[PDB]
Structure formats: C-alpha cells, structure tokens
Amino acid sequence: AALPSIQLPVDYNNLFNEITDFLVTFKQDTLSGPKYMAMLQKVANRELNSVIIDLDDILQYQNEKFLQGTQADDLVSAIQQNANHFTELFCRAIDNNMPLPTKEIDYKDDVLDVILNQRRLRNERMLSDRELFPPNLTRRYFLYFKPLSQNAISSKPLSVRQIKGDFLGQLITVRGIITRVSDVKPAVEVIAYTCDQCGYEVFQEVNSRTFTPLSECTSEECSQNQTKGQLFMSTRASKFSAFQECKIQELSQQVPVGHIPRSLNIHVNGTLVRSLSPGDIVDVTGIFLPAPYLLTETYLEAQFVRQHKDVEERVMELITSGDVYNRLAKSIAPEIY
Amino acid sequence: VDDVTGEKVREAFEQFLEDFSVQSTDTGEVEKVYRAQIEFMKIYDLNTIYIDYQHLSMRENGALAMAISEQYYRFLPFLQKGLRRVVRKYAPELLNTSSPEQTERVFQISFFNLPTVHRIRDIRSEKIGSLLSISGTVTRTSEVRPELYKASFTCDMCRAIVDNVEQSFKYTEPTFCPNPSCENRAFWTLNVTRSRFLDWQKVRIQENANEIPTGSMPRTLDVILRGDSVERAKPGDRCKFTGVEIVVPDVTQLGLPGVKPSSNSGVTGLRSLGVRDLTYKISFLACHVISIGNERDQEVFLNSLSSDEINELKEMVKDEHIYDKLVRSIAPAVFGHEAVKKGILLQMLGGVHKSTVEGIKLRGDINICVVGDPSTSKSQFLKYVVGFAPRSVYTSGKASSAAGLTAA
Amino acid sequence: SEPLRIIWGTNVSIQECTTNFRNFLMSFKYKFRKILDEREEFINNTTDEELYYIKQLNEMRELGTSNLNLDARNLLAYKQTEDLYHQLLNYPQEVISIMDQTIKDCMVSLIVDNNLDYDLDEIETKFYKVRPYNVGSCKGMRELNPNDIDKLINLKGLVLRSTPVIPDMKVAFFKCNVCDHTMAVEIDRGVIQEPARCERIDCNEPNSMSLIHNRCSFADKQVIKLQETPDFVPDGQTPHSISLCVYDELVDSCRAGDRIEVTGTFRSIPIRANSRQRVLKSLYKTYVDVVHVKKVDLAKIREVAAREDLYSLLARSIAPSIYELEDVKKGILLQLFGGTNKTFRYRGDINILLCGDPSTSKSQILQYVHKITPRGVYTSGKGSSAVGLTAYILVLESGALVLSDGGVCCIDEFDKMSDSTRSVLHEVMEQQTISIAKAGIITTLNARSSILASANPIGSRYNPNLPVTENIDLPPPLLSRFDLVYLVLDKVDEKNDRELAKHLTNLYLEDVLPVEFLTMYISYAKEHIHPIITEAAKTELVRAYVGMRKMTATTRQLESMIRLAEAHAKMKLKNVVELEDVQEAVRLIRSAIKD
Amino acid sequence: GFELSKLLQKEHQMRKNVIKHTSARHSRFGGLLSIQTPDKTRLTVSGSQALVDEKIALQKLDDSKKWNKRIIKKEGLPNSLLNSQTGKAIFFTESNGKHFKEFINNFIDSGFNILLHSVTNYFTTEQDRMVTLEQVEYLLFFAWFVKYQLLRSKIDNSA
DNA sequence: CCCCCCCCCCACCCCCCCCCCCCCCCCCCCCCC
DNA sequence: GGGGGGGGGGGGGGGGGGGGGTTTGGGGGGGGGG
Ligand SMILES: [Zn+2]
Ligand SMILES: [Zn+2]
Ligand SMILES: [Zn+2]
C-alpha cells in the first residue's frame, strides 16, 4: 500500500535540538543549576517520578532567546498543536541527558537492572567475535505538560461541548464535573517474554488498546541457530504503568436550554492516577485524542489537574477570652432567634 | 498395548460375579446371588445388574473394591468385559435384545450400598473418576433424550460403512475412510438404524436443606442419568445417588460441527483448540438413584408380600376385633382423643371412588377438620399423618397462597 | 565449573536460599521471636526453648496433614534467614516452592534420622504446603499499584460471594488412538505440552495421541469477590473490590459476610478481546493468589462446675452492667442452656417474653444476650411482616427467624406485631419449622430458634391494678406459648432507685464475669450435658401440673416445666434431672402463671 | 485378588514417581528458575520442581525442543508371535486353560513325532515350490511344540 | 379485615485455519577404488 | 570392503483461499388504605 507525502512547516531534528537546549539551560531566573537538570538529579536518585514541564518555562526561555536575538521557533505553539509527539521528544532528550544518581539505591534490587546487566554481559560475550532495550522499559519517570498561565489556548478552560474535532492533537484544558471514576488497573508499557529454549528475553512495546502476543523467539540467539523457541510472558520483567479512566461531564449550569449534558472520557496514567474522584468539579489539562472505534472514539489524556476545592496554640485565643461554652452556644446559627 | 491391571481387575471381578456365595436364615445352600441375578435378568430380559459394594469389599482382601472405588472410570470397561463373559457362560440369550438382526444388548452395572455419602460441598477434584455416593434434592429433571452411545457412518464418496465409533463429549465422526481405494477424510452420513443410542437425562441437584451450614444459598451440581435409571427421580425429591464424579469440557470451545466456539481461565496448547483454551464443569454420572425423603385388586398387591407378611395379614383378619386395635394404633404420640383417631383411620382408608352413567364422578375422599384450642394435641395429629401416610403434604393456613395450594 | 540454580532476574542462589531456610525450619526456638519483637520481658523456657517448627512438623506428621502455617516475622529472628524474608516478599513463588520442597525434605529427614517405622511412602506421596502469613502492614485495597504486581501482599476485606469449586488440570492424560499406549503431561503455565508423535518407538505415529479428559488429574480452584470494607472507605464514594483465587483445601475456607485477612501474591493476567483470537487487551486483569487466610479448655470448665454459688455466678455474668434482676437473668441462663430432644414433634427449646414498661432496661438485656449467644439474631416486631421475619421471594431467601436457626432470636417491640406474624411464630413455637406453600415453592423450612421477645403494655405504662394479660393486650394463649413471662416496671422507689443509680454510676469508677468464659461454659455444657429424667422429677412434674390445672392451665406448662428442668439440670454439669430442677422450673413458672 | 494387589502396588510405584515429578501448587503458580551454566550465560524454565532439582531442569530444557530427527518407515500371512506386541497374552478361562493344555499334552504324547515326520518327510521334497506362508507356519509349529515340551518337562519329570 | 395497587421478574477487514504444492534432505543401493 | 554419488521417498514450510465475528403483558407476592 503506497502512500503520498507532503512537505510541512516543521522539523523535529531542529525542535529536538531546541528541546534539549531548553532542558540543559533553563532556570526560573526571574525569581533570583538548571531547574530541569536539578529535577532530573532528583529523578536519578529515584526520589521523584512525576516530571512536570511548565509551558510558562518554555515561554520564558523563548522570550530569553528572542531577547538575545535568535528565533526559538515557538515551541509553545508546537507543543500546543501536536502535544503527543513532543512527549516522545522530551523523554528522548531526558534519556539522552539525565545525570547519574547521587543517593545510594541498592541498584541490584531492581529486576530491570539485573536483566539488562545480564543482556549486556551476553552482548559482550557476542561482541568479542566468538538499542540494548526499548527505552520505555528503562524509563522510570512519567512526563506531563502543564499549561500556560493567564498572560495561550491551553490556558482557556473549555466546557465539554466546546471540545470540537479540530482540537484533536492539541493540549487543551477542560472544565466540568467528574460523574464516574474507574478503579486503578495496570497496563503494559513493554511486555517482557522469556524464551524457553535459549533464555534470551525479548520485548514488545504496546501502543494501543489491544495487542497480539509473540510466539516464536525473534532473537539472533535463536534465529541464527534456526531454533524455533517459544516465548512466555513475565509480569515480573514487563513494565506496567498505572491506568485509570474518568468520565467528565459539563456543569449543569452550562447546558443550553433543552440539550442533554455532554460528556467525555479522561484517561490518566502513571503517578497522576487517583487525583480525581466522583463529584469533583475540576479543570484538567490534557491531549484531546482519537481512539479506534471513519468515526473515531475520543478521549482526553490527562496531564495536569486543578481541583476547584498551630491549632492547639490557636484554641488558646478563645479559651483566654472566657465564658466559652455560653459564647460558643451563642455562636451556633446566630441568625436564628 | 493391553492394561494388565485392567485385565486382572476384569478377571477378579468375573470370578466374583460368577461365584460370590452367601445365604441367610436357612441351611448353607448358597444362592450365588449375582449368578442368580443374571438368571433373573434373563427371565425378565433386563439390561442392568445391581451390585452391593460391601460384597466386593469383603471379597479377596477388598483390593478389588478399593480399586473400583478409587479409579472407577479406568476400570468400568474391564468390568463390562468381565460381565459379558459371565453372561455368556450362564445366560447367552441375554447378549442380544432377543431372522431380523437383534442388536447386541448393553449392560449397566448399578452399584449400591456405598460406605458413605459425600455432600455436594465435599466435591473435590481428586475424586474425579472415582466411584462415590452423593445426595441432594432434585430441582429439575430434563427431557429424556437419546445420547449417541456408539456411532456408524457411511462415506459420502463411496458407500463403505464405518462402525462402532466411540463417542467423546462431542458428536464424533471418523477421520479416515476404511477403504484404501478411497481418499476421504471428514465427510460422512450417519446410519441411524445401525448406530446405538442410550436413554439420557440430566438432573440438577442442590444441597440438602438441613445440611446448608446456616440456611444460606445451597450449592448445586449437575447429575447425568442413563438407561434404566432415567425418569426415576422427580423435582423436589430428596435422593441418594451413586456413580462417578467427572469433568465435562466446554464442547463448543473444543470445536463442534455446526456450532461456533463460545464467545478465571482454561487450558490451551491442545491441538483441537488451536488458539482457544478449554474449561471444564464437574458433573456426577449416576448409575443408581433412590429417594431418602395404587393397587386396585387384592392379588396384584398380595403377590408382592413375603410369606411372614402374609401371615401378619392373616392374623389381622383372624383377629376379628382388630378394628379397635387400629384406632389405638393411630397417632401413638397423642393421648386420648379416640374419636379423632377413629376418623383419621377412616380418612386414610377412604371411601370408594365412583363414576356414573352420565360421567359424573362421586367423591371417594373423606375431608376432616379438627377444631380445638392451640394448646391441644391438634398439630401432633397433622404431624403424625404427615410422618406416616404415603403421598401426604403439610402446610400452614397463613404463610401459604391460593396458587401454592391448587396450582400456579 | 558447575551450573547454578538462580531465581530468575534476582541473582539469588536457590541452593543458598534453601540452606538458609532449612537451618531455620530446624533449630529455630520461639524465644528468638520474643527477642525480635515486643514482650521480650515474657520469655519462658518451657514454651520458648522448643525447636518450634520441628514441634510443628512432628505434630503435623502424626496428624499426617500437608500444611505448615508460618508467621513471616519469624524469618527475621534467625540470623541465617533475615535476607530470606526480603527474598520471600519480593520473589514469593520461587521462595515458596523452595519452602514447600524443604518441608517435604525435612519430613523425610526426620523419619530417617529417627529411622522411624512411619511410612516413607506416605511422605513421598504427600504434597506439602507452607502457608506464610503476617507478612507486614495490611495496606489498603485502594492503594495497590504496579510495583506490587509480583510481591506478596496482605489485605483485610469483606467476602461478598464465591464461585463453586472449579477444576484445574494439573496433569494431562494422553492415549494413543493406534496402539492404546498412555502417557502423562504436567500442565506448564496453563499450556498442555501435547506429544506430537506417540511415545512408543515401535508405534511412533504422528498426531495419534488424544486427551482422555476424565483420566487427567485435577487440582481445585475457587474465585471469591473480596470487597473493601465500608469502614475504611473515603465515605463519599464506593468501596472497591478485588477477585482472589484460592486453591486445593483452602477452597471454602470462608463464606459470604466473612471479614477476613488474605495473604497472597498479587498477580495480573491479560484478557482476550475475543476468545476466537490470541488478541489481548492492553490493561491487565488483577487478582491476589492466596497462600493463607484468617477470620476478622475443659480443665477450667470442671473447676467452675463444683461451685455452690454457680447459679447466681453464671446469672450475674450475662449482664453485670445492668441492674441485677436475677430472676430474669436466671430465666435467660436456662434459655441459654436449653433442654434435650427426642426423635420418634417436640424440641429442647426455651422461649421467653420480657413484658413490662417501655421505660426499662430489657432491651439492653436482649442486646447482651444477642452478643452472648453463638448464632442468634436481633430484630423488632412493629410492622414486622409474616414473610419478612421468616422467608421471602427466582428463589426463596431466609428471614431473620430462620437465620437464627439453633440460637436465640431477640425481638423487641413484640407487643406491636400483627397477628399474622404471630400466626407464623405459632408453628415456630409448636414445631420449630415453617410449612411454606406458595407459587413454585413448597417446603418445611427448619428453624430451631429460642425466641427472646421484648414486649410492653398497651400505652405508656403498665396498670398495676390489672393482670399481665389485660395489660399486654396480646391474647392469653400466645403468652402460654412462652415458658416465662416477666414484668420489669419503672415504679418509683427511693431504695431501688438509689441502689440502681449506685449500680449504674459505679461503672465509671473501676478500671465468672466475662462473656467469653460464659459463652464458652454454655457451649461446653451444650456439647457435654444432656440430662435424663429421674423419678423424683417425674413425681413433682405430674403433681405440680395437676396443681396449677385446678388453681386453669395446659400441658404446654408441663412441657415447659420439663424443658426448664432439663435446662436447670445442665448446671453443675449435673447431667441428670431430679426434684430440685423441677421445683425451680415449677417455681419460676409460678412467678409467671399468676397472670 | 492377591495378584491384583501386587499389580496395583507395582503401578503405585509409578504413581509416587510421577508425584515426585509434579508441582505442589497450581499450574499458574509458576515462578522462573534460571540455570546459569558453567559459562556466564543463562537459560530459563518454569518448572517448580525443577527449580529445586537441576536434573529436572536440564532434562526439561531438552524436552522443550520442537525439533526431532525424522525417522523412516519399517500381507499374505496371519498375525502371530512373529509380529505381535511382545507382552500380548490370551487370558484363558481356567476350564479352557485345562482343556487346551490337556489337548496339546495328549497331542504331544501321541501325534507329534508321527505328524512331524510325515510333513517334514514331505517338505524334504518340493522346497523350491514351498509357498512362503507354508514355510513360516511349519517353522512356527516346530518351535512352538518343541518349546512347550521343554517347558512341561522342566515342570514335570513325568514328561 | 379485605381488597386493590404496585412492584418484580421473565421473554468489511483481519485472524485463525486448513489445504495444497514444491523443494530439500536423508536413506538405500550400486559402483568404484 | 568401504565410501561416494545417484535416485526416490517423505516431511516440512510457505503460500493462498475462506469463513466468521427494549417494550408490553401477564401472574403472583407483598404491602397499604377504607
Ligand atoms: Zn530464544
Ligand atoms: Zn470412502
Ligand atoms: Zn501409539
């Protein structure tokens, strides 16, 4: 099936370079190492997993570069336009630049360290003439974009019925009431299969609501020996991510006269899970996305959340004033005679 | 390869069946009961034999009974082989239904009098394939249907016939044509007249009312009846069963002609499943069933009674003031109330049902009401009749409905 | 120079793990646990110096039972096994395989070290399980997350319901269609390793093997829906629930309504998009795969049985917090004892009605008795339906009284209950069973409950110038169903009111009384004491009934006297009814029958 | 029954053997053994029993191979001791056993040498024309009755 | 206490699969050294 | 007398084709009003 192609006004090589430049340079200098590299040292210590990017930081960096007389190609517009792809770009930049840990971890206790060390040892045994992994497997953190402040489309809180099809791919922000919340369930980022007949594990990344499991060992260890070994899934070695779904509905006041209240599925992943509960009235930033059902199913990949909603010394302020029972009783509904 | 264990089990069972010796309250003219029962089957041209489990248990150090208890499902064909040889030895007329071809006769080995009754809640899968006895109350009974027992087919492209095709839980067809001049695999027509069927009836049981631990929901089990045991049970009856605890696969998932696979876990890899994975129910394959909860001529009743029972009836009619003794035998837990006891006797004896020249029926039954204070013995009269009389039922005036009374 | 057995993904040597566990399974002393934990001051040699898990293994061998229960904290006390606790919590399947095999190995080691006559063949036949428990903090069901997915966890929760037992194939059985040779295959990770050609080289036909289903060998599996308790929820939103798989003899270890702990490996599995396809849905199903479960003697009994004050001693213990009212407490004590039974109908029940004002403590007495009894129920009679109290409609489900089969049924507000519902309780008190007949449902539903009714005079007060029948407004023969009927009244008396106020206000001063011993004593009496009647009881039974019959009475009083005398004869473990039992049964009835 | 008990004990030995070769817990319970070889490389198997017995692990790894060497194959006469499975036996009824053994006894005691002389003194002639079936049946006759009389004479000095 | 109400319960593409064909390997037989 | 080469059988792989994947009425039970 041949495909046509077109030229477009973007370049992900140039923007990848811009993203890593931002990452290794920026700090919140108006408040006077880089914010993001320091935060990635916290990630390297395994003290943090929620990597938050502020679009305001990107905007400040763009303004700093433009002030220094070079065009920054408006990365804010690009991430507000095709947000999902720039998750991949930002994560690749982090994986290419994150510094080593400082705090001790007891590194062998993670199965991924042992299994990838064993694969490296095996690959060195091969490499004496006698990627190592898909990066999502090793990537422990979760990356989220946080919207622009008032000062731009990501900043505006849309009601659900204003979310039209032209917004698909954009990092929009929605407003409504959560009518339902799912229980948490795990979802596979990367499946790890053992191979029975050679022990060389193999990996499948999953990027859809369904997949088909592997059967035959595709590794060179088996394939060169034409040994049709069988693959078995391991939950120990597979990377899971926490998944949860929530149904958001527009506010009852926003419903036009006679219309049914419109609603949307929000999907939330990683550490951002269980930030929402039913009956919450909330603003949520996310990528508005299609899903396989020409009519597509659709959902919002959540990224950032804004909910709408000492003492034992301070009690002495009333105790010292005296007759507190009589006064506190008189403070019960003072508007009632 | 022949299973020497099964062959030796067959030999031991065959010897038992032909010469197991016992007699009681008589000289030692041993009846050799199961040989005599083959003769009884031959006289009445039956197709089943009833075996007491304890008789096997005492026989030859009990090893045969232990084996047939533990691993019944392996050893049942070997038992039928032994039985077939014994019946040939002492009653060869029974080997056919008994010129037009009389089919070979099938034989059911109905065990009874097992050491213990396991509850439905005691079902545990190591007892799969073992002979047990089971109890519960029957909630519903299926239509009696013909199970295809052993099948016969003719090939579509040559009119050769395959025969004696043993059936799995699926309707099973031959894989290869017997004719080496023919090419066929899997294209067949069933010869109905040559194929063999069994009367078949599924019945579902549930855990007994007094045995449910705290009056909660009872547990349920599917039971299979076949042959002469079908349609003996009834809904609401409380029954003891004996037979084999068995697994039953999801036959649709296994693949079945004319049916799609059905669309917690099963098991996969087996060739017939391909990608699919198979699940199993548990069921009880019953060989014998009994409950644990009229004659209109004197001869047809009296010919069922023993000689000493006949003597009891003779003493009863000889004792011509028996009429008083009967009334005093009514409701023995209740003191006094002789008039009620007399009426209860006359109700249980009833009048005579009659039909008139115009078709009008005239009632035979006698209807009685016993009026009294609630401290009186009144309810014990009802519980006596309910405990004593055949085909009798008990309910309360409150906590019952017109539907539950006549019919719903 | 040699291969190494490694727990995959961990670099743990399995041989070293095995030795580290073996050297704890033997030579461990329970004192080491008291060195690890609190209560270190209470080390006691004659209970702590035993080789505790060899004591377990020897008792286990004498009983011939497969299971060793193992508190996980004990691994941290023994020096060579501290690391193995962490290995267990992080890699439970492999460590538990090691522990199971080591238990079986140690059973062999003990009989061969002792060179004992116990069957080696039995030990070799027997499978052996460790059941580890008390793993750690019982983290909430709501809090489980992808890091837990292979760990051992422990959850507190409520069982909503369970499946029937499900057969799980552990060994497949393959028979050759050509040559009738048979072979066995252990199921590996749910996959049948089918032989592609027949094993016998003299046959070796391809695709000739077929699965003989009922000659395969099966383990037991059961699935149970375990709910987050409504106690622990953030109360504005629903409780969660989790499926758990429970296996072999752990099947049916719990029932609907049980609050339990379950200790197990957390697990996850994919689920198919369509059973006709290999295609899997991205988000896995999750379940806990359990290895241990938990809910929520006579020498002492004989010592108490010899006491002379034992009648009052047991009577005070039922409710020492309430005013002493000891005729009521003694009558209830006889209701807790019960009589005896005869199958030829009658029952060894006892039935009581607390009349008196609504302004008295009888409801609290009922509350304590409902706590004391093993299997009772509590409800109240106002607006109580004849079917709601009893059994209701498709299936019929049991009501409160039927759920109280074999225990005390407390019913408050009994005087306000409609005559229809009383008409159902007639056959409870007369036959202790319910003779239903409705559309599709006919049954004699057995319900052997000792009713403890609490009732009132009509209106705000009892009239002292009238008998109890004229006050209570329930008809006399309904009162004659019950054994004892009592008046407890609020009438002013400064002596009684002072001593009651003192009795009540003494509760706030202090830091057989306890109900645990009372209910144990009643239980042991029910298991052991079944009094037969002596002629010295018969004579007074016949005489006393004929007395109150020409005071005007019925045989239900005589039957009540019999059941009460048998209940009285369960005191002092007497096990024989005599004159005094009848005298007290009669005497307490003389307090009641005066009306 | 005595011999049946003996047989059942013998196959109960195979029961305890397969039980040793069987998991103590359910099939979905399987953890992973890794066999690190004497070299710095690793294999993987799911056998819970194999996890504590490397012999089982090694042989199970070998059982897992899908490959096999392909094996190549290998009428006017009846089935016999020439082509039956080596454990096959006729399970006589004891009356038929007595009747058959006494019949062949009396045959050996009368008809054997005379018959064998007659037919072998035929088969001296016409060997070139002796049909294959006739050859094999003659040889089997010879072998069977010679073997029987040797065995009976080992059992009976009277023979 | 009796009757009426009302509530419940029920009746087009992609994957798996199977069939057909072609090639390659392995054994047996014959010739050559 | 053993090893190579030629010829025939048998098995495995790969490709191609095909099929499958909520309203309305009635009875009976249960509860409330005259
Ligand atoms: Zn491999
Ligand atoms: Zn044909
Ligand atoms: Zn075979």
Coordinates of C-alpha atoms and ligand atoms in Angstrom, one line a residue, chain A residues 195-200 217 219 221-222 227 229 231, ligand 1:
Chain A
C195 CA 12.5 -17.7 25.8
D196 CA 12.2 -21.3 27.0
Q197 CA 14.9 -22.8 24.7
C198 CA 17.7 -20.1 25.0
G199 CA 16.9 -17.8 28.0
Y200 CA 17.4 -14.7 25.9
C217 CA 11.8 -16.2 19.6
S219 CA 16.3 -13.0 18.9
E221 CA 20.5 -16.3 19.6
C222 CA 17.6 -18.5 18.4
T227 CA 15.8 -22.8 16.8
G229 CA 11.9 -21.4 20.6
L231 CA 8.0 -17.2 24.2
Ligands
ZN1 ZN 15.3 -17.9 22.1

